[PDB]
Design a protein around this ligand. Structure first.
Ligand code: BEF
Ligand SMILES: [Mn+2]
Length: 128
């Protein structure tokens, strides 16, 4: 995938944002921004330029499902790759996020390899 692709990592806890950010760096992605919740993420997305979004689920103000539904419902970013990286592991949740339009879904804790696979799987599905 184009290494200049701009990523937006969303999670209410920095620890996870730092993990995702550093992993993207390893894969060759340095154009990466962060966000602490759904609202904060929509704001930055509003500032245009993003081509991929990795997001957590449980977050205050606006959670990950709501954020995914928002992105998908907006014609200016409806096809925006959204990879869910959450600790929510119940199948009723994986179904909800998948049905809402999730590009992928990874459960915490995850390995470096798992993230790369799931990311490459997205790039492959969308021809990136
Ligand atoms: F709070 Be996240 F869903 F890990
Ligand atoms: Mn969280």
């Amino acid at each position: 995938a184009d290494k200049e692709l701009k990523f937006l990592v969303v999670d209410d806890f920095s620890t996870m944002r730092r993990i995702v950010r550093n992993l993207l760096k390893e894969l060759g992605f340095n154009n990466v921004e962060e966000a602490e919740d759904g609202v904060d993420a929509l704001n930055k997305l509003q500032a245009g330029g993003y081509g991929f979004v990795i997001s957590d689920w449980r977050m205050p103000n606006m959670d990950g499902l709501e954020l995914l539904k928002t992105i998908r419902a907006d014609g200016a970013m409806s096809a925006l790759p959204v990879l869910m990286v959450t600790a929510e592991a119940k199948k009723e949740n994986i179904i909800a996020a998948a049905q809402a339009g999730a590009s992928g879904y990874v459960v915490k804790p995850f390995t470096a390899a798992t993230l790369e696979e799931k990311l490459n799987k997205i790039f492959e599905k969308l021809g990136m």
